Amino acid sequence: TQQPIVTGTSVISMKYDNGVIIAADNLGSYGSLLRFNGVERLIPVGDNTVVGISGDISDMQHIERLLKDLVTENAYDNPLADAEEALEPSYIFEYLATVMYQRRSKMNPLWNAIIVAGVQSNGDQFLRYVNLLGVTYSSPTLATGFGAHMANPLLRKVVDRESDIPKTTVQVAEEAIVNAMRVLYYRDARSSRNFSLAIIDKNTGLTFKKNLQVENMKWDFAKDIKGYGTQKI
């Protein structure tokens, strides 16, 4: 029985030929007050997974804690903790899925939307979503909040179906991701310019970039607009 307070906006992601990319900005909004400007919302779990979270920040922070503990406790009496019995993206996701649906069923949800992106032991990309109601689904592209509306249409023009994944490059993909991010800054009143991006490639492993910014902005055209119809100057 709650109501989010400090929040974070979209998280966008897509999977490519040899990995997956995911991103999210660094803002913690308090209603219409863009309150916190240094909030990482992309959570790296191990070396093959990043979980992006949007929704109530306090619950996110709680999920951060749950994730560290999940790691700590997998090391326990596990000789293969840094290998064959390391946390796979699917394990992390199914755990989180499970928790979300249990909290919704108790009527005390974790007010979030989460995307778990990563690559499995055998090389398969993994990208899936779960939210405050325990609804889960997967697609070559995935986004939460505004990103579902704006980013998905864009990200899908690159990967419209499964067969397109093997034909898509990191460069293509990352380009897309950054554009979508730019778009969102233009049309989402709750976005911020600063963001974090992360790629999880079956070869390069996990690359996590911090402090990216939306650039190449088209605002120049604003000068030729005056009034709202009949006004001349």
Partner: protein, 233 residues
């Protein structure tokens, strides 16, 4: 002496022995014989089933815990049920909550912890059955030996029950050989049967008499009884 310190599991003898636990271990030595042995690709269980009359069934000694794990019992059957049932639940939980096949090593760790509670708690009673556990997982084949004392050990092979020592020595020599039986199920089984025959005296192992179980790479834990073990005598 003994008669004073063997009243329960919450009493240590003046030597530092736990008699109730020790007495528990004895019901195992009273049980029929079973053997386990693993190569690098499969793990087999061969167990001699024991009838009560020539007019009865041969007590089932092997139990499937998951598609990837199972065990042969030696001793008090009920306690076997209680324990395998627990092994079934923990396997289920891993699948459900993490979508992860339970690590035999972990299954081991869990069994030890369960028995131990009945070896330091009042009015409780140690379990009276030993268990041979085999399974294939993310790190190959495994065989685990469980004792009511709470001690669990992973071995290339072993045997328990009455006259177990026969097979246990047999395998101890046969090691260099069987551990190399990769990709050939029937052979390991054979090796198992031979080993099991090393602890015989009664009569030769027959149809109603034998019980074998196998798990491996592309082989789900399957139970072979009677009509199907014929080719292995």
């Amino acid at each position: 002496f003994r008669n004073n310190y063997d009243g329960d599991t919450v009493t240590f003898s003046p030597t530092g022995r736990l008699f109730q636990v020790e007495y528990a271990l004895e019901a195992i030595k009273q049980g029929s014989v079973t053997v386990g042995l693993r190569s690098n690709t499969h793990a087999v269980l061969v167990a001699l089933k024991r009838n009560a009359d020539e007019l009865s069934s041969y007590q089932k000694k092997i139990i499937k815990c998951d598609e990837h794990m199972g065990l042969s019992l030696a001793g008090l059957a009920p306690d076997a049920r209680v324990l395998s049932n627990y092994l079934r639940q923990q396997c289920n939980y891993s699948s459900l909550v993490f979508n992860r096949k339970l690590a035999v090593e972990r299954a081991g760790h869990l069994l030890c912890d369960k028995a131990q509670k009945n070896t330091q708690s009042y009015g409780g009673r140690p379990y009276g059955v030993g268990l041979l556990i085999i399974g294939y997982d993310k790190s190959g084949a495994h065989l685990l030996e469980f004792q009511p004392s709470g001690n669990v050990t992973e071995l290339y092979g072993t045997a328990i029950g009455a006259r177990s020592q026969g097979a246990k020595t047999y395998l101890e020599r046969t090691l260099d050989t069987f551990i190399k039986i990769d990709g050939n199920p029937d052979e390991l089984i054979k090796a198992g049967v031979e080993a099991i025959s090393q602890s015989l005296r009664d009569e030769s192992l027959t149809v109603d008499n034998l019980s074998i179980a196998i798990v491996g790479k592309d082989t789900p834990f399957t139970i072979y009884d009677g009509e199907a073990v014929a080719k292995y005598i």
